[PDB]
């Protein structure tokens, strides 16, 4: 029937914006405002547990936004891993397609993220624990056929006990560019196709920053960033340049001063041998030599924490038949509506 909102929903302002919540979720508290929605904390009065709720903002404003909202919902539902953010619930106050304007994702509450807690040197033990969890989550999503492609401290959620969950996976897409400090060179320069080790470069960059307190690579433009990367990796030789699909990039590399790779124990002078060795194997330009998540998990650096039983894989690949369909906003909206109706914890 026609309603303003579903039975058992209430209206409340959160951060000067109107939210509509099921009565089971109480004490909504503003956490943050972002590009696609906004987040609050709330208590599930059935359990007393604190949760995060993300309200999608105008997900039907464009095909780009609607397709993203749909894919995100599918991704979050598909993955079931401790170190990958997942869904406790999904809902809309809408009573029909007519009044379907937005929806809400309920997720475990994570107090902070690695960007907020970074900037000084961490203990190697803390690094071991956090990096181990990142790699477990990557192994999992990779095993479902899904890469992050934009892994960074800000999308690694952490709690006070240093439990970690990967956020915003599977959703990657002037004279100016955004920061790309953690992105793999093959992505920045499109000089060969990436594989899943694209994310392992990122882990390397994150781990380096945890070890030193300093961002490993910056740069004002792609070539400046490349210069910074090569100061660490060395100028690659024949085995690597033969693999490039970008002939001008190959020529550029072959024309540089052919500076050898630095000893990582000197580049990272306070790192243990195991830490330096793992970094050597993650910060590798050759996408076929770079460690996979599963390989990295076997490294001695993780010996204190390693539990093979926790290093699970997805049983089934992520399978969205509509990934490459061009549909109207209304068509995407209808797919999302149905996906919410079909949801079960």
UniProtKB/Swiss-Prot annotation:
The source's domain of life comes to: Eukaryota
Tell me what this protein is called: Mitogen-activated protein kinase 13
Q: Which reaction does it catalyse?
A: L-seryl-[protein] + ATP = O-phospho-L-seryl-[protein] + ADP + H(+); L-threonyl-[protein] + ATP = O-phospho-L-threonyl-[protein] + ADP + H(+)
Record's GO cellular component terms:
cytoplasm; cytosol; nucleus
Spell out the family assignment given in the record's similarity comment: Belongs to the protein kinase superfamily. CMGC Ser/Thr protein kinase family. MAP kinase subfamily.
Instruction: Identify the EC number(s).
Output: 2.7.11.24
UniProt-listed CDD domains: STKc_p38delta
What is the role of the protein in this entry?
Serine/threonine kinase which acts as an essential component of the MAP kinase signal transduction pathway. MAPK13 is one of the four p38 MAPKs which play an important role in the cascades of cellular responses evoked by extracellular stimuli such as pro-inflammatory cytokines or physical stress leading to direct activation of transcription factors such as ELK1 and ATF2. Accordingly, p38 MAPKs phosphorylate a broad range of proteins and it has been estimated that they may have approximately 200 to 300 substrates each. MAPK13 is one of the less studied p38 MAPK isoforms.
Instruction: Tell me which residues make up the Protein kinase domain.
Output: 25-302
Report which gene this protein is encoded by: MAPK13
């Amino acid at each position: 029937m026609s309603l303003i909102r579903k039975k058992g929903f209430y209206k409340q302002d959160v951060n000067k914006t109107a939210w509509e919540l099921p009565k089971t979720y109480v004490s909504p508290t503003h956490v943050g405002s972002g590009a696609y929605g906004s987040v609050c904390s709330a208590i599930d009065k059935r359990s007393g547990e604190k949760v995060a709720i993300k309200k999608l903002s105008r997900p039907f404003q464009s095909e780009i936004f609607a397709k993203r909202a749909y894919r995100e919902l599918l991704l979050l539902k598909h993955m079931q891993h401790e170190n990958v953010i997942g869904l406790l619930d999904v809902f809309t106050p809408a009573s029909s397609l007519r009044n379907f304007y937005d929806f809400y994702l309920v997720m475990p509450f994570m107090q902070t993220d690695l960007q907020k807690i970074m900037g000084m040197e961490f203990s190697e033990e803390k690094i071991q624990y956090l990096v181990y969890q990142m790699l477990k989550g990557l192994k999992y999503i990779h095993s479902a056929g899904v890469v992050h492609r934009d892994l960074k401290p800000g999308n690694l959620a952490v709690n006070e006990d240093c439990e970690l969950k990967i956020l915003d996976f599977g959703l990657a897409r002037t004279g100016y560019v955004v920061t790309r400090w953690y992105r793999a060179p093959e992505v920045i320069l499109s000089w060969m196709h990436y594989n899943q080790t694209v994310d392992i470069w990122s882990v390397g960059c994150i781990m380096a920053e945890m070890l030193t307190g300093k961002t490993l690579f910056k740069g004002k433009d792609y070539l400046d960033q490349l210069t910074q990367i090569l100061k660490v990796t060395g100028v690659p030789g024949t085995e690597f340049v033969q693999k490039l699909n970008d002939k001008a990039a190959k020529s550029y590399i072959q024309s540089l001063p052919q500076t050898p790779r630095k000893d990582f124990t000197q580049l990272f002078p306070r790192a243990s041998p195991q830490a330096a060795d793992l970094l050597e194997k993650m910060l590798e330009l050759d996408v076929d030599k770079r460690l996979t998540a599963a390989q990295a998990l076997t490294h001695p650096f993780f010996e204190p924490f390693r539990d093979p039983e926790e290093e699970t894989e997805a049983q089934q690949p992520f399978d969205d038949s509509l990934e490459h369909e061009k549909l109207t906003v209304d068509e995407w909206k209808q797919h999302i509506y149905k996906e919410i109706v079909n949801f079960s914890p």
